[PDB]
UniProtKB/TrEMBL annotation:
This is Dinitrogenase iron-molybdenum cofactor biosynthesis domain-containing protein. InterPro entries: Di-Nase_FeMo-co_biosynth (IPR003731), DiNase_FeMo-co_biosyn_sf (IPR036105), MTH1175_dom (IPR033913). Residues 14-104 form the Dinitrogenase iron-molybdenum cofactor biosynthesis domain.
């Protein structure tokens, strides 16, 4: 599956999870196979630009995400993901690599 994580800086697998969802400057899209990370793609969040906004959950879904791991996120975005069949896990902390591995190991 594909997991999406908003990150605040591009440090590849070590990109730190963003405190906020909608305005994160990038999203890391992580493919998982055999219960382990298979590929990490860091992409600019088009809605992080000044005065450009809207449908960020849709952009995440478009990219194939079935789950999104975040720290903070608004009720509206959570509702939008739920309405589109995307699981949301909040309150995570760590780099992209760490939070996906935590997820995969049941932590």
């Amino acid at each position: 599956m594909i997991i999406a994580i908003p990150v605040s800086e591009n440090r590849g697998k070590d990109s730190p999870i963003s405190e906020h969802f909608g305005r994160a400057p990038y999203f890391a899209f992580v493919k998982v196979k055999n219960n382990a990370i298979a590929d990490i793609s860091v992409e600019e969040n088009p809605l992080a630009q000044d005065h450009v906004h809207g449908a960020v959950p849709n952009f995440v879904k478009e990219k194939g995400a079935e789950l999104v791991i975040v720290r903070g996120i608004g009720r509206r975005a959570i509702a939008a993901f739920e309405a589109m069949g995307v699981k949301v896990i909040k309150g995570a902390s760590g780099t992209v690599e760490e939070v996906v591995n935590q997820y995969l190991s049941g932590q």
